[PDB]
Ligand binder design. Structure first.
Ligand SMILES: CN(C)CC[C@H](CSc1ccccc1)Nc1ccc(S(=O)(=O)NC(=O)c2ccc(N3CCN(Cc4ccccc4-c4ccc(Cl)cc4)CC3)cc2)cc1[N+](=O)[O-]
Ligand SMILES: [Cl-]
Length: 137
């Protein structure tokens, strides 16, 4: 379910680049918000991308550093969307550098963070149905 959302979002962003991974309302609303975040914040996106030096020995560190930064002042739906776009960017970028092996690992790190750290805020703020209600269509 957190798993499901992650795989869905990551599969989508990978597919938009021509790569193959290899609640529908929640899933669509999340993809759509990701597309829109990535355009509105395309400068922040490219600042990030051009400063990730991905290696497998630093990838977790890079993920954690950015995710800690992202939620440092609190959690809101927009930041949750940005969290998924970041993981998408990380995956796309790993494939570019021929570190395809990291994709499955990035998905695991993402689900764990959701499960451990984002879940209490999500449940307290109406769950994903409330996300859909506020930012769907
Ligand atoms: C009906 N529908 C068409 C309406 C669409 C509107 C506008 S689109 C959008 C804007 C921001 C985030 C997500 C989507 N939706 C919306 C509007 C507002 C909100 S919100 O109030 O809950 N949140 C925000 O407005 C918000 C949240 C985060 C945010 N960031 C901008 C800068 N980045 C940079 C950054 C800083 C620290 C660490 C990492 C990053 C970062 C993360 C990912 C990447 Cl790829 C690059 C850099 C972080 C988050 C900007 C705005 C959420 C949402 N929403 O979740 O859908
Ligand atoms: Cl906080």
């Amino acid at each position: 379910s957190n798993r499901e959302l992650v795989v869905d979002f990551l599969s989508y962003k990978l597919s938009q680049k021509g790569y193959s991974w290899s609640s529908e309302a929640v899933k669509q609303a999340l993809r759509e918000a990701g597309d829109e975040f990535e355009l509105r914040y395309r400068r922040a996106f490219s600042d990030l991308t051009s400063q990730l030096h991905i290696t497998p020995g630093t990838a977790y560190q890079s993920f954690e550093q950015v995710v800690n930064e992202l939620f440092r002042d609190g959690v809101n739906w927009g930041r949750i969307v940005a969290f998924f776009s970041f993981g998408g960017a990380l995956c796309v970028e790993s494939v570019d550098k021929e570190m395809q092996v990291l994709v499955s690992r990035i998905a695991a790190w993402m689900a764990t963070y959701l499960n451990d750290h984002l879940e209490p805020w999500i449940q307290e703020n109406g769950g994903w149905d409330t996300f859909v209600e506020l930012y769907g269509n």
